[PDB]
């Protein structure tokens, strides 16, 4: 358990390095690889059933992870607009996960996620 | 410590002061230190030769690197590579001809040196002479023969068409022969190898490349469908041409791969949907329902394909009322095939041409794969995945889904022919006497553990190429080790530990439920068989399991079952723990095991005395059977015993109790007629 937790810390760190460099593609690939957050509307249930099985330090990183993933989906939608159905499906899945998650996170992050959903709508 | 290194270097410069010439010392000082290294290594001048030559060559000093390499080859106390640099230099400079000839006479498989020799000849054949010598040495070198044809109309075209019709697996020889024909003027094996190749490449990209239902495997399926239509419309194979049976086998395999892609698309997107399994059932049926080509390759491919298609056609609809509905709805003249084709190849392959509209399906009907056909085709598919734990656990779990324990003994007497059926003593942890029951029990336990883990999607098994690992790492390791032992400084700790575990020795890590499933399976399997010298062994082994479990079931008095902080071989939870309720059941089954083990050797008196404790229906039934076989023509007053036991059996059949291995309809009529006529 603690070993895989460390693996999760390493994965989140590398994905954060890519997000801080601007690597939206690899960021999405790593977010899909870690399989912690809802990438599909039906996957909200599975990720929520798994979320109670995480260490509390993972409940400490899930908020920033969700903000970054919503921003990534918004940036991918921006690229597709400036060059989107799957992107909006991912936004709705992120909304479902962040809303049914047992982690009462900062309402401001939910407000910004809803703002991104709107600017995608 | 770099300080100790620098100290060595100080001592080294001193040692070049002292040993004035110091060639090796200077080379080693340059080695300790690129610019100063190159200068000092040039002063010292294999290390000096290679450093100087590579530096000059990469700087473009072909002549200077030639000087270095040629001088090192002329001193030759240790030098190999110098010939290459000398040849390339003399080329870049009549001269390089001899050096390229030397490279060829040291290794006639020299493509680059042969090309350089061709350039030398064009700046000055006889490269065809060197290549004819290479062919006289290694005549199977079709590529050397093609190079000789390239250097060479008669012989060039002969030795180009020959090797092309010898391999044909590379456009190289083909383009060379075409170019030879054009410059001079101015088949079915190829199609077979291309079709056999394309099938393998499709399956490789599908399974091991792990295409996430994206272009990776889909474009290869497009290539496969295109080759299928091409060979179909061009070589509409007649009876005598083997492309007929090859094309039909590839037709079945094409439908199989299409079904696999539909399943994988569903799972990759979200999950095996209700909308991508029906044409997939049509695909797997359109693979099973093609006739057996009756060539070992083709026979085994048909075996594997029909086996897998049957497993999947029974798991996709365990319940009936699907085959006929699928046939009558999802297939038609153009509509069914168009909805099947758009899903495979999205707007990249038109319907009328270059597609599956050409091949017909209306010949197919309703035919569910039979349970004996499936057993024989599983035995046949056991030939091309020999000893794959993944394949064995896959087939085991699929037969388990069929609600029937698989014929493990047939598969194992196929895989491992010589492994003994039993061992003399089960009280010994000895590795070199692996018995068939040990590995069959390992198979069963792994099967049930994977079943519980997968339980903890309309196809439950996710066919062989697409799914994940089915077994755990511990069991994988033990399987590798025991396979390595049987099918031969061997590290056998896993073998010895897991044999301690499997034979249920002094200390084991598994709990009752595993041993109970073992013993039940052993009991039914041995009882089904008729052979005395297998029933003896199998009942001995199952009674062994239950007797080793006997004291284990006794420690269950509001205390720990068996303390296992780490999982040795099999540790799950919330399934194994036997309630105090099931203690009575297991004790009664132990008593009938005792009685029947006592009965199937010749101690019929204590057989009855042992059956005279339990009060179930099988006990009555076995006592009646032994009394009858005892007194066919012995006594009359012993028949009242059959009357009474079968009357109790009738009272217990009134409730419809089906615990008897043979139902009441044939047993109670037999005994009822026997009692009435003798009454």
């Amino acid at each position: 358990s603690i070993n895989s937790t460390f693996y999760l810390l390493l994965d989140l760190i590398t994905f954060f390095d890519e997000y801080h460099a601007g690597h939206i593609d690899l960021s999405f690939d790593v977010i899909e690889r870690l399989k912690l957050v809802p990438l599909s509307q039906d996957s909200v249930e599975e990720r929520v059933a798994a979320f109670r099985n995480f260490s509390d330090e993972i409940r400490h990183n899930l908020s920033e992870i969700l903000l970054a993933t919503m921003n990534i989906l918004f940036t991918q939608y921006k690229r597709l607009k400036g060059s989107d159905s799957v992107l909006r499906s991912q936004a709705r899945a992120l909304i479902t996960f962040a809303g049914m998650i047992p982690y009462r996170m900062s309402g401001d992050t939910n407000a910004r996620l809803v703002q991104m959903e709107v600017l995608m709508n | 410590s770099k300080a100790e290194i620098q100290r060595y270097v100080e001592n080294a410069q001193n040692s070049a002061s002292s040993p004035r010439e110091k060639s090796m010392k200077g080379f080693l000082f340059a080695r300790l230190y690129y610019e100063l290294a190159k200068r000092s290594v040039s002063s010292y001048i294999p290390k000096a030769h290679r450093f100087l030559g590579q530096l000059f060559e990469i700087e473009g000093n072909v002549e200077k690197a030639v000087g270095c390499y040629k001088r090192s080859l002329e001193l030759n106390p240790t030098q190999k590579d110098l010939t290459l640099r000398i040849a390339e230099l003399i080329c870049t400079l009549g001269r390089a001809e001899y050096w390229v000839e030397r490279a060829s006479k040291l290794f006639p498989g020299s493509p680059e040196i042969y090309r350089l020799k061709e350039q030398l000849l064009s700046s000055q054949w006889n490269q065809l002479f060197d290549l004819i010598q290479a062919e006289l040495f290694a005549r199977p070198n079709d590529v050397y023969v093609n190079l000789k044809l390239v250097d060479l109309r008669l012989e060039e075209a002969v030795l180009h068409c020959l090797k092309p019709e010898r391999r044909a697996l590379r456009t190289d020889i083909e383009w060379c022969s075409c170019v030879v024909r054009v410059f001079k003027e101015y088949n079915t094996n190829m199609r077979m190898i291309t079709k056999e190749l394309l099938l393998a490449q499709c399956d490789v990209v599908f399974l091991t490349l792990s295409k996430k239902d994206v272009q990776k495997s889909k474009e290869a399926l497009e290539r496969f469908d295109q080759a299928l239509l091409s060979v179909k419309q061009s070589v509409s194979g007649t009876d005598a041409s083997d492309l007929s049976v090859t094309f039909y086998e590839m037709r079945g395999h094409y439908y199989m791969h299409a079904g696999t892609l539909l399943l994988k698309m569903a799972q990759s997107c979200e999950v095996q949907w209700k909308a991508l399994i029906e044409p997939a059932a049509l695909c797997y049926l359109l693979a099973y329902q093609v006739p057996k080509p009756k060539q070992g390759f083709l026979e085994e491919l048909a075996f594997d394909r029909q086996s897998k298609s049957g497993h999947l056609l029974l798991t996709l609809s365990h319940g009936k009322q699907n085959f006929i509905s699928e046939i009558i709805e999802t297939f038609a003249n153009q509509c069914g095939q168009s909805i099947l084709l758009k899903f495979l190849f999205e707007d990249n392959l038109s319907m009328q041409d270059s597609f599956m509209g050409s091949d017909d399906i209306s010949y197919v009907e309703n035919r569910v794969p039979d349970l004996s056909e499936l057993s024989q085709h599983d035995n046949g598919s056991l030939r091309i995945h020999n000893g794959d734990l993944q394949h064995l656990t896959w087939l085991g779990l699929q037969w388990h889904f069929l609600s029937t324990l698989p014929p493990l003994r047939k598969w194992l007497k196929q895989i491992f022919p010589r492994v003994p059926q039993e061992t003399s003593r089960l009280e010994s942890n000895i590795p070199e006497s692996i018995c068939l029951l040990d590995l069959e029990v390992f198979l069963l336990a792994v099967v049930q553990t994977s079943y519980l883990q997968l339980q903890d999607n309309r196809p439950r098994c996710l066919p062989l190429p697409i799914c994940k690992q089915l077994f755990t790492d511990r069991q994988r390791s033990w399987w590798d080790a025991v396979y390595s032992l049987i099918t031969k400084a061997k590290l056998r700790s896993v073998i010895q530990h897991d044999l301690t575990t499997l034979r249920a020795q002094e200390k084991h890590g598994l709990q009752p439920a595993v041993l109970v499933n073992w013993a039940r399976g052993l009991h039914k399997t041995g009882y089904s068989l008729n052979s005395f010298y297998d029933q003896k062994e199998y009942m001995g082994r199952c009674v062994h399991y239950w007797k080793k479990l006997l004291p284990l079931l006794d420690l269950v008095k509001q205390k720990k079952s068996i303390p296992e902080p780490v999982d040795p071989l099999f540790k799950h939870f919330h399934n194994k723990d036997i309630k105090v309720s099931e203690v009575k059941d297991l004790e009664d089954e132990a008593c009938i095991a005792f009685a029947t083990l006592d009965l199937v050797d010749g101690k019929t008196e204590d057989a009855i005395i042992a059956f005279e404790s339990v009060k179930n229906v099988v006990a009555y039934w076995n006592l009646a059977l032994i009394y009858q076989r005892k007194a066919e023509e012995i006594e009359n007053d012993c028949l009242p015993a059959e009357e009474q036991e079968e009357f109790q059996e009738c009272l217990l059949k009134c409730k419809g109790f089906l615990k008897m291995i043979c139902d009441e309809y044939s047993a109670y009529p037999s005994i009822a007629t026997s009692l009435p006529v003798p009454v």
């Binding site: 479902t96 809303g99 309402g107 401001d108 407000a111 | -």
Partner: protein
């Protein structure tokens, strides 16, 4: 204002809450508005209005957070075990019966919470006596830094509160009330078109297209009127 410039909910909450409940009342030296105009400073009354706008925004965000929790709090369906036996059939039937009342209770909860939060949000969108994040006394000396703080608060909360109202309306199926956010913005009394730029009004117009989609699907006209 400094904490709002970074949207630190707990920080601003502390700043507003640890402050006494008696500050304004104990600061009001003269109650009769005639003398209260004199005693009231262009800075003291302005700070009182700042505290009132802070409280309004805090309520409009806390209520929105509670409504956001309650929106996805909604109950799930009862599990269907294929080929259910008699016991499983009866238990799933009872679970369906209970879920059909759980969803109704959650609907009532949604109605109450959405109504309260929307009331507070509309209060914040149209603060009385000149609007929120605006001083009421013009006789104050030059305070350009704090004036720009209030300007940034308006420019960062007006389209934000509008997006919250649009999302809450969409959630409660208030498509007509969400399309009337256009009139809420263009209202000449509030001049809410002056706090949202072209991009914000563009996103709100796409949200109005979304709301009109729901209305036309529910068979009402683009304005919520009977076709």
């Amino acid at each position: 204002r400094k904490f709002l410039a970074s949207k630190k909910h707990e920080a601003a909450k502390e700043v507003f809450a640890k402050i006494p409940q008696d500050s304004i009342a104990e600061i009001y030296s003269q109650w009769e508005e005639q003398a209260m105009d004199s005693a009231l400073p262009a800075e003291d009354d302005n700070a009182i209005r700042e505290h009132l706008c802070i409280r309004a925004y805090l309520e409009s965000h806390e209520a929105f957070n509670e409504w956001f929790k309650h929106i996805n709090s909604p109950p799930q369906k009862p599990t269907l075990v294929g080929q259910a036996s008699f016991t499983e059939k009866v238990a799933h039937e009872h679970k369906e019966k209970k879920y059909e009342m759980d969803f109704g209770i959650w609907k009532g909860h949604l109605d109450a919470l959405t109504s309260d939060v929307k009331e507070k949000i509309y209060n914040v969108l149209l603060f009385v006596d000149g609007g929120w994040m605006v001083d009421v006394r013009e006789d104050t000396e030059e305070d350009p830094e704090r004036s720009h703080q209030m300007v940034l608060l308006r420019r960062l909360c007006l389209p934000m509160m509008c997006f919250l109202l649009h999302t809450v309306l969409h959630n409660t199926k208030q498509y007509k009330d969400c399309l009337r956010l256009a009139d809420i913005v263009s209202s000449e009394n509030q001049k809410l078109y002056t706090v949202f730029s072209k991009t914000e009004m563009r996103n709100l117009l796409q949200k109005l297209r979304e709301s009109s989609l729901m209305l036309l699907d529910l068979q009402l006209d683009p304005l919520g009127y009977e076709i």
